[PDB]
């Protein structure tokens, strides 16, 4: 979880599944509210 | 930067 913090846009590309899972379902599942 | 990301499946 400390590796995914230091991922830069010039070295990695965010996949569509981590777009559709870690931004809409689970922030509403754990009361995060952006 | 070129040959080893082909083998190791980095792909930018």
Question: Scanning every residue of chain A, which has its alpha carbon at the shortest distance from the alpha carbon of B11?
Answer: A12
Asked if A20 and A28 count as a contact pair (C-beta separation under 8 A), the reply is no
CB pairs under 8 A between A and B: 3
Picking from B5, B2, B12, the residue whose alpha carbon sits closest to that of residue A14 is B12
A-chain residues near B10 (CB < 8 A): none
d(CA B4, CA A33) in angstroms, rounded, equals 41
Helix intervals (H) in chain A? 16-21, 26-29
A28 CA: distance to closest CA in chain B (Å) = 31
**What was the elucidation method?**
cryo-EM
């Amino acid at each position: 979880v400390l590796n995914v913090h230091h991922r830069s846009p010039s070295t990695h590309t965010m996949a569509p599944w981590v777009k559709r899972c870690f931004l809409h379902k689970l922030p509403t599942f754990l009361f995060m509210k952006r | 930067l070129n040959l080893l990301p082909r083998v190791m499946f980095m792909t930018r």
